[PDB]
């Protein structure tokens, strides 16, 4: 059960998250919970760790900028983080808020949430499951989500590669700064597209 890892039941967690997140975001989290379970079944990842991490991945999505900056200082995180924003922070810094609120200390779950946006050059299968589940959950409808879904039915590594390539492409298309850890993921995984 979820209380093996956190300080309340799944039902109680959902009630708390319903106060912190808008409806669309909570529905997304429920979508990622389900998608993570299915991917974990497929690729030999603990289904419970994957479901919980999937549900929690966007827990800190709505923390204010000031709250993140306070967390960066309190936990003495990389000071370069202050140069970025919510996209980077909600996972990479938000894990500390999740830890404070829910008493979450499992290192594997924490890491999977931490890098769910930007990935890393080295990812555990659990990391990969969350990173992919986020992109392919059933509420997502962006063009090419069908391709990502097909890829994820066959290869976890190729799905990471595909998602990361599309994200780099889209950020450059839009003219948004690209957090360097994303490129580390991109270069580590791009060979799987062949």
The contact set with Mg ion (CB under 5 A) reads 131, 134
- Least distance to ligand ADP, CB of residue 3, Å: 25
Binder among 178, 187, 191, 193 for ligand ADP (CB under 6 A): 178
Which sign does the torsion angle of CA 194, 170, 181, 133 carry?
negative
Q: Which does 194 bind (CB under 5 to 8 A by kind): Fe ion, Mg ion, a second copy, none?
A: a second copy
Whether the Cβ atoms of residue 63 and residue 25 lie closer than 8 Å to each other: no
Would you state the structure tokens that stand for residue 145, as one six-digit string? 């989500």
Binding of a second copy at residue 177 (CB under 8 A)? Answer: yes
Binding range to ligand ADP, per CB under 6 A, among 2-10, 33-41, 67-75, 173-181: 173-181
Binding range to a second copy, per CB under 8 A, among 48-56, 102-110, 114-122, 174-182: 174-182
Q: Report the interhelical angle of 125-136 vs 47-56 (nearest 10°).
A: 50
* Dist. CA 113–CA 101, nearest whole Å: 15
Give Cβ neighbours of residue 91 (< 8 Å, ≥ 6 apart).
57, 60, 113, 114, 115, 116, 117, 118
* Dist. CA 100–CA 182, nearest whole Å: 27
**Interface ranges with a second copy (CB under 8 A):** 161, 165-166, 168-169, 172-173, 175-178, 180, 183, 186-187, 190, 193-194
**Interface ranges with ligand ADP (CB under 6 A):** 28, 58, 61, 87, 116-118, 134, 167, 171, 176, 178-179, 182
């Amino acid at each position: 059960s979820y209380q093996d890892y956190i300080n309340c039941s799944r039902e109680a967690l959902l009630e708390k998250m319903a106060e912190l997140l808008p409806e669309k975001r909570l529905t997304h989290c429920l979508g990622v919970e389900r998608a993570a379970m299915e991917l974990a079944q497929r690729f030999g990842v603990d289904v419970e760790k994957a479901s919980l991490a999937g549900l929690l991945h966007d827990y800190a999505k709505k923390l204010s900028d000031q709250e993140f900056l306070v967390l960066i200082d309190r936990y003495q995180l990389d000071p370069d983080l202050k140069n970025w924003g919510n996209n980077v922070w909600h996972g990479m810094v938000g894990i500390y808020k999740i830890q404070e609120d829910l008493d979450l200390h499992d290192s594997e779950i924490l890491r999977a949430i931490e890098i769910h946006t930007v990935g890393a050059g080295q990812m555990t299968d659990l990391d990969k499951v969350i990173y992919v589940a986020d992109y392919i959950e059933h509420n997502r409808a962006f063009p090419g989500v069908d391709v990502a879904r097909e890829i994820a039915s066959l290869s976890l590594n190729k799905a990471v590669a595909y998602e990361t390539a599309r994200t780099v492409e889209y950020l450059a298309h839009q003219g948004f700064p690209i957090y360097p850890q994303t490129l580390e993921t991109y270069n580590a995984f791009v060979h799987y597209l062949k």
